[PDB]
């Protein structure tokens, strides 16, 4: 019974039955780049396989999706900085990574972003990284804390970029409405043609605002739920669990509190409902969450305390199972 090492900042994507886990870092360096960990949501068993081909660099903060058991990976932070390279791994059939020579203007090199999937489009939003190579659609805001501790300052963007998998070509939609502020470590979830985004870090706040981009018309909408809302946070997970509900777990507050609360957002009612679960002593940030075909949300990895104090950080290899349906 092999078991993967603890990590935060990894990626995890799922087909509803199997959950693929790649990358991340820990304390006590990056997790090995060639490994792909497969967790069976039914048997609860892990399996490690080695990948070949254009293996991506070891990274934290990468953004990944699974569409029809093809894995796509964008962005991240490796030993020499952020990237905007795009990879594909076909898991349908030893697995081979392919780095894609994309057409069009790619996003700026960045990590800690999110993605929506809608038909042939991968739609990426926000994140943290270098100044863009062009005045492209959207805004970018420097993080002044990066001016004095590195050789290349970095900041937050509110960019929306489309990767069209019919041609592997980058574009940007002309949107209407008020886009969210630039941010990183937000969480994105897709239901129907609505690409939701909750929270994230921007300047001196970790936020609790909720927006959605209509992925057909490209109109931004801010959602203002009535009643109690979850505390503002970054590094939380947000997962669709039905055509009407999003599941929220964990994260990190403005004043640096690890979180163990869970909520469901009822889309039809525009209302948050706090979710009762047995992991109140297991806060997690920079974990991943994947929904199963069996009505559960599978959380893996992440950190139980303030990961910014790297020498004390408590990175986890635990699986937390939330029974949402």
Ligand X SMILES: COCCOc1cccc2ccc(-c3nc(CC(=O)NCC(=O)O)cs3)cc12
Interface with ligand X by CB under 6 A: which residues? 112, 128, 143, 184-185, 201, 206, 234-235, 252, 307-308, 310
Name the phi and psi angles at 221, rounded to 5. Answer: -135, 135
Return the ∠ at Cα 86 (arms to 115 and 149), rounded to 5°.
Answer: 80
Q: Which is nearer to ligand X, 201 or 284 (CB)?
A: 201
Residue 115: CA atoms inside 13 Å, Cβ hemisphere, count? 26
Q: Which is nearer to ligand X, 27 or 171 (CB)?
A: 27
Q: Which is nearer to ligand X, 31 or 184 (CB)?
A: 184
As measured in angstroms, the least distance from the Cβ of 143 to ligand X is 6
As measured in angstroms, the least distance from the Cβ of 252 to ligand X is 6
Residue 307: CA atoms inside 13 Å, Cβ hemisphere, count? 26
As measured in angstroms, the least distance from the Cβ of 234 to ligand X is 3
CA separation for the pair 125, 287 (Å, rounded): 19
Q: Which is nearer to ligand X, 34 or 143 (CB)?
A: 143
For 239, the token pair is 């997962």
Q: Which is nearer to ligand X, 49 or 308 (CB)?
A: 308
Q: Which is nearer to ligand X, 88 or 131 (CB)?
A: 131
SS (H, E, C) the chain: CCCCCCCECCEEEECCCEEEEECCECCCCECCCCEEEEEECCCCCEEEEECEECCCCCCECCEEEEECCEEEEECCEECCEECCCEEEEECCCCCEEEECCCECCCCCCEECCEEEEECCEEEEEEEEECCCCCCCCCCEEECHHHCCCCCCCCEEEEEEEEEECCCCEEECCCCECCCCCCCECCEEEEECCEEEEEEEEECCEEEEEEEEEECCCCEEEEECCCCCCCCCCECCEEEECCCCEEEEECCECCCCCECCCEEEEECCCCEEEEECCCCCCCCCECCEEEECCCCEEEEECCECCCCCCHHHCCECCCEEEEECC
As measured in angstroms, the least distance from the Cβ of 307 to ligand X is 5
As measured in angstroms, the least distance from the Cβ of 311 to ligand X is 10
Q: Which is nearer to ligand X, 10 or 206 (CB)?
A: 206
Q: Which is nearer to ligand X, 220 or 235 (CB)?
A: 235
Is there a contact between 161 and 188 (Cβ–Cβ < 8 Å)? no
Q: Which is nearer to ligand X, 40 or 150 (CB)?
A: 150
As measured in angstroms, the least distance from the Cβ of 101 to ligand X is 29
As measured in angstroms, the least distance from the Cβ of 115 to ligand X is 17
As measured in angstroms, the least distance from the Cβ of 8 to ligand X is 8
As measured in angstroms, the least distance from the Cβ of 111 to ligand X is 9
């Amino acid at each position: 019974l092999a078991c993967p090492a603890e990590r935060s900042g990894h990626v995890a994507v799922s087909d509803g039955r199997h959950m693929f886990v790649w990358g991340g870092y820990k304390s006590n360096f990056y997790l090995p780049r060639e490994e792909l960990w497969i967790y069976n949501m039914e048997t609860g068993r892990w399996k490690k396989i080695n990948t070949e081909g254009d293996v991506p660099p070891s990274m934290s903060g990468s953004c990944a999706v699974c569409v029809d058991r093809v894995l796509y990976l964008f962005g991240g932070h490796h030993s020499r900085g952020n990237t905007n390279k795009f990879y594909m791994l076909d898991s349908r059939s030893v697995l081979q990574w392919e780095r894609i020579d994309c057409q069009g203007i790619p996003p700026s090199s960045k990590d800690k972003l999110g993605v929506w999937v809608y038909k042939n489009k991968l739609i990426f939003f926000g994140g943290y990284g270098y100044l863009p190579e062009d005045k492209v659609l959207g805004t970018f805001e420097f993080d002044e804390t990066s001016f004095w501790n590195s050789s290349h300052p970095r900041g937050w963007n509110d960019h929306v970029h489309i990767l069209d998998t019919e041609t592997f070509t980058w574009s940007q939609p002309i949107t209407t409405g008020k886009a969210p502020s630039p941010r990183a470590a937000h969480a994105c979830a897709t239901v129907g043609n609505r690409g939701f985004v909750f929270g994230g870090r921007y300047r001196d706040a970790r936020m609790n605002d909720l927006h959605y981009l209509n992925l057909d018309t490209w109109e931004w909408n801010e959602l203002i739920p009535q009643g109690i809302c979850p505390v503002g946070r970054s590094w939380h997970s947000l997962t669709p669990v039905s055509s009407d509900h999003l599941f929220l777990f964990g994260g990190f507050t403005t004043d640096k509190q690890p979180l163990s609360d869970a909520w469901t957002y009822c889309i039809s009612k525009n209302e948050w409902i706090q979710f009762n679960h047995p992991y109140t002593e297991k806060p997690r940030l920079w974990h991943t969450a994947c929904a199963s075909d069996e009505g559960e949300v599978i959380v893996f990895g992440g950190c139980a305390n303030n990961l910014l104090v790297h020498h004390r950080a408590a990175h986890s290899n635990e699986i937390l199972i939330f029974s949402v349906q």
